[PDB]
Paper text:
We have predicted and validated a set of OTU deubiquitinases encoded by several classes of pathogenic bacteria. By determining the ubiquitin‐bound structures of two examples, we demonstrate the novel strategies that have evolved to both thread an OTU fold and recognize a ubiquitin substrate.
A crystal structure of a covalent EschOTU‐Ub complex was determined to 2.1 Å resolution by molecular replacement with Ub and a sieved model of the OTU domain generated using MUSTANG (Konagurthu et al, 2010; Figs 4A and D, and EV4A, Table 1). Perhaps the most remarkable insight, which will be discussed in a broader context below, is the permutation of the N‐ and C‐termini that leads to altered threading through the OTU fold. While the termini are typically in close proximity above the central β‐sheet in all other known OTU folds, EschOTU threads a loop at this position and the termini are instead located in the supporting helical region beneath the sheet, near the helical arm of the S1 site. The Ub‐binding S1 site is comprised almost entirely of a primary interaction between a helical arm region and the I44 hydrophobic patch of Ub, and makes very few contacts through what is normally a secondary interaction site in other OTUs. A small secondary interaction site is formed between L241 in the edge strand of the EschOTU central β‐sheet and the Ub I36 hydrophobic patch.
Numbering used by the authors:
A (entry chain A): 185 to 362
B (entry chain B): -1 to 76
Write the structure that this text describes.
C-alpha cells in the first residue's frame, strides 16, 4: 500500500526555488534582465527546430545577408524585421513600438518570405501568432532552465543593481554554492 | 609570454585570442572587435564572477592560459 520503490529526477524544494527565480526575472518586462533572456531563448528554440536567427545592432555594415534565416534589427531599444527587395536592397519592416516588438518582428519576418514556422497549432486559432510564440518561449525557458543558468548569472552581474544582486544570491544557492 | 584565452558570447559563439598578461581590458576589447566586428563600447566582459574594467590588466584578475571570458551584449528591446 505505501510506496516502496523510488526514482526521482528533481527535488521538490529545488523546483520551487527555480519558480521563484523565474518570477523575479520578470520575462514580460523587456527593459530589465528578462529582455536580455528572451532573445537568447528565441535563438535556441529556433535552432532546435533547424532555423537560424540573426540579429543586427544599430547601423552596421551588413557584409553578407543570409536570406534563409530570420533576420532582425535592434537599433534604438526597438526590434524591427529585415528583408531584401529589388535584387539586392535591404529594407526594414516596421512593427508596433509596444513591449512586444521582439515577437511581432519574428512573425512579420515569417510573413514576408513564407519561411517555415516552428510554433503554434489549430487549438490556438483564436489567439494571435505573436502570443503563441511568446508563450512557447516562456515554456522553453522554464523547462530547459538549467541550460541558461550561466547566461542568467552573467546578465545579472552585468546589470550592477541591488535588485539583480538579490536574484544572483538565489541563483548561486540553486547552482549549489555553500 | 603570449598565452591563449577564449571569449564566449552568451549564445555560445567562442573565439580564440592570444594575449599578454599585461594587456589592458580595453585592448582585449579591441582584439574582439578585430575578429567579431563588435565595437568596444558595446562590450562587457565577465570572468570569475566579476565584470572586467577598462584601465585594468588581465593579470590583475589572475586570468591564466586557456581561461574563458564571457562576452555580454545588450540585446533588449521593445
Amino acid at each position: 500500500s505505501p510506496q516502496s520503490v523510488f526514482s526521482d529526477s528533481v527535488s521538490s524544494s529545488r523546483l520551487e526555488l527555480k519558480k521563484q527565480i523565474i518570477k523575479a526575472l520578470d520575462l514580460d518586462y523587456w527593459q530589465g534582465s528578462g529582455g536580455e533572456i528572451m532573445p537568447l531563448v528565441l535563438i535556441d528554440f529556433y535552432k532546435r527546430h533547424n532555423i537560424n536567427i540573426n540579429i543586427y545592432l544599430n547601423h552596421c555594415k551588413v557584409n553578407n545577408f543570409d536570406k534563409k534565416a530570420i533576420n532582425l534589427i535592434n537599433a534604438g531599444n526597438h526590434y524591427n524585421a529585415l528583408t531584401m527587395n529589388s535584387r539586392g536592397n535591404i529594407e526594414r519592416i516596421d512593427v508596433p513600438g509596444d513591449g512586444n516588438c521582439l515577437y511581432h518582428a519574428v512573425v512579420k519576418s515569417h510573413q514576408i518570405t513564407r519561411k517555415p514556422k516552428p510554433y503554434g497549432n489549430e487549438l490556438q486559432k483564436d489567439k494571435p501568432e505573436w502570443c503563441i510564440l511568446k508563450e512557447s518561449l516562456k515554456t522553453h525557458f522554464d523547462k530547459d532552465f538549467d541550460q541558461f543558468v550561466e547566461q542568467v548569472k552573467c546578465i545579472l552581474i552585468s546589470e550592477n543593481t541591488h535588485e539583480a544582486n538579490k536574484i544572483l544570491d538565489k541563483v548561486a544557492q540553486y547552482s549549489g554554492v555553500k | 609570454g603570449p598565452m591563449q584565452i577564449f571569449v564566449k558570447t552568451l549564445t555560445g559563439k567562442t573565439i580564440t585570442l592570444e594575449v599578454e598578461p599585461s594587456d589592458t581590458i580595453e585592448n582585449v576589447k579591441a582584439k574582439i572587435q578585430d575578429k567579431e566586428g563588435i565595437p568596444p563600447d558595446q562590450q562587457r566582459l565577465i570572468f570569475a564572477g566579476k565584470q572586467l574594467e577598462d584601465g585594468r590588466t588581465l593579470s590583475d584578475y589572475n586570468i591564466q592560459k586557456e581561461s574563458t571570458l564571457h562576452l555580454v551584449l545588450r540585446l533588449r528591446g521593445x
